[PDB]
Assembly symmetry: C4
Amino acid sequence: TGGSVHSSPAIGQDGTIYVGSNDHYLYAINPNGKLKWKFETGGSVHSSPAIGQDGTIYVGSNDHYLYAINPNGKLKWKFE
Amino acid sequence: TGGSVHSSPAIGQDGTIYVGSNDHYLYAINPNGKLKWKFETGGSVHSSPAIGQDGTIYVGSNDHYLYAINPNGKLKWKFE
Amino acid sequence: TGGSVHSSPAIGQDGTIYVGSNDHYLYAINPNGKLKWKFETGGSVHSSPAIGQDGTIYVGSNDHYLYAINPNGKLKWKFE
Amino acid sequence: TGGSVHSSPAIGQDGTIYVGSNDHYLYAINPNGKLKWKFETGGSVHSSPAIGQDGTIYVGSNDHYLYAINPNGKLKWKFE
């Protein structure tokens, strides 16, 4: 990534690896090591993502929001 | 939240998202992105919550206590 | 505890809460909020404990060791 | 290890303990406390490893890469 990965990776049901970067992105990486998508936050992602039972990816940023991201990489909502 | 979310979210059995803020709150957020409740601690919550088998939410604060919070957002106990 | 809890709590099979303190202890706390035991390390425990399938508690210290602690609070081994 | 263990240990299906060190290694430790292997990264491993369903070990370094490591300690891939 463009920054330190302090974020601890979370693993989807299909083996997708979700991890925050200090570069401000949440990364979705396929088991093959190819980018699936990256989600632009406003701040460093030191928070380790969590995966809901419907596959939703939750993670906090230094931009003060908790992000809920759809498995396809589109914002579901952000909580300030 | 009112602060950085370094806290890694934990997910309840019903999909509730629990996460600490540097603003001193533990947040319970519904899958829909609406606040369920927030619990006021004395310090930054960098600790990532854990969920007991009875649904109890455990998390540490920079105020030096480990908090046990009922799913309804009321204090069960704090350990100094 | 005697310090900040940056350590994220881990939950045993019986509901025991394991958490590191910057005070240098790993704490085992019963679901009732009473101390079960505390294990003295040489350094801050920022590491979040993990629980093996046999109930062994693993956690790192700023004293440079990974600790394996028996459920009864006695050292199994430490890896430098 | 040669450094602080801020990395939270992850546990394999066979009970293998995976943990990052600030010394730049990911360590695989047998339940008996003997080194299985250590994987050399370019930076501090503060990230807590995660284990895929095929046993792959994922972890980020301060060297900016997310590492995918085979259970036998050989690099599968790294994502910058």
